[PDB]
Amino acid sequence: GSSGSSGSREIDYTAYPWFAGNMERQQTDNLLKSHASGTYLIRERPAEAERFAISIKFNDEVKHIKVVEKDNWIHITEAKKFDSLLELVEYYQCHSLKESFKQLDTTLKYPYSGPSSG
């Protein structure tokens, strides 16, 4: 129960096309693997502290990153703080993910499968 900090309106991550939510892991590596070497997506995980994740298809291998939410902040591997998930995404969207993971060098290019209605 964070005391002092309040929240009037939180950013809706489920409004973006690159939003996946609580999809099926296997489904992620099944749809991503097929996608191109630039398909990224953001999924959520059943946890109090870590309730966010990011999966991007790069190097013929689907990588799954974990998000940490502490002190009303959102970041990964405590390498860089961001006002919120949105920021963290917009950051890599242009800056390669090498900074956090050398082995991984890419930037959110295209979204995931996408919500196909109809």
The technique is: NMR
Annotated domain spans of the chain? 11-112
Give the tokens for residue 43: 């999924």
The 10 Å CB-count burial string (b at 16+, else e) for 34-53 is: ebeeebbbbbbeeeeeeebb
What CA–CA distance (Å, rounded) separates 18 from 20? Answer: 7
Using the Cα atoms of residue 76, residue 77, residue 83 and residue 88 in order, give the sign of their dihedral. negative
Contact, 32 vs 39, CB < 8 A? yes
The helix (H) or strand (E) run that includes residue 91 is helix 85-92
| Cα Rg, the chain, nearest whole Å | 14
3-state secondary structure of 90: helix
Domain covering 11-112, topology: SHC Adaptor Protein (3.30.505)
What CA–CA distance (Å, rounded) separates 35 from 40? Answer: 9
